[PDB]
Structure 1
Amino acid sequence: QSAQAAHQALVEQLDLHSIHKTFRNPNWRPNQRRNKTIKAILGESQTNIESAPSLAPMKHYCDVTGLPAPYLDPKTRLRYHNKEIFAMIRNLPQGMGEQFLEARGAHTV
């Protein structure tokens, strides 16, 4: 069917593997280990000393609705706006509480 033929035409038209690169040196071949993560690079190097913490007191926002939160729930440690969201928070599925923490990089353990 023409739709499949057209899609295969586009796939062949777009592919780079069908194209020979005269500008590419065939003799050089990379080290297969060359792909390394930042932690590996920094750990092996041991200026990415440009990050900075803050000392000011941070504001408190509701983990559910993002509105300001007067309250921190001592049980689930979610911050919440009002009693309606406290009801929602306590009714959450057993996995969901850790997701609200984790959306702000917090975790319960």
Structure 2
Amino acid sequence: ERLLFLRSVGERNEIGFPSRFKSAHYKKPTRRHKSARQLISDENKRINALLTKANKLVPKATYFSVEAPPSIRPAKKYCDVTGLKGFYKSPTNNIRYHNAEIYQLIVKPMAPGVDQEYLKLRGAN
């Protein structure tokens, strides 16, 4: 019953290859997987080709013009271990910490490979 409960919905919610909701002709084309990282790159090179053709047309609303500009105020500094206000930064692994006992218990005896993951959260590696 438990192994046929899924099969009941399977034989209730199916659609065959001659699809009713699709058109009479199909002519389905082939496509690549087209990951989202390279889509930005091909849009950028298309746009750059458009400017280098038109120059030898100011853009108005593109993907790279609507993205937010960097801030003007200085960024606040926080402790990497606790999230509190970071007053000091260790010179070896460049980790901002809060006080002395945080430095003794966590920041000093930490293993290599952990500091890069701590710096990954704010993207500082």
TM range (shorter): 0.7 to 0.9
Q: In angstroms, what is the RMSD of aligned CA positions?
A: 2.3
Structure 2 distance, partners of 1:34, 1:101, is 32
Structure 1 distance, partners of 2:85, 2:69, is 26
| Code of the aligned partner of 1:83 | A
Structure 2 distance, partners of 1:39, 1:14, is 43
**Of the two structures, which has the highest relative contact order with CA contacts closer than 8 Å and spacing of 6 or more?**
1
How does the TM-score come out when normalised to structure 2? 0.68
Among candidates 56, 61, 78, match of residue 61 of structure 1: 78
| Code of the aligned partner of 2:27 | W
**Per-residue deviation, residues 50-91 of structure 1 (Å, max 9, x unmatched):** 220112111110011110001111111011111122121122
Aligned residues: 103
Give the share of equivalent positions with the same residue, in percent: 29
Among candidates 87, 94, 106, match of residue 112 of structure 2: 94
Which shifted more, 32-41 or 58-67? 32-41
Structure 2 distance, partners of 1:42, 1:14, is 46
> Which structure 2 residue ranges, 5 or more long, are not aligned?
49-61
How does the TM-score come out when normalised to structure 1? 0.77
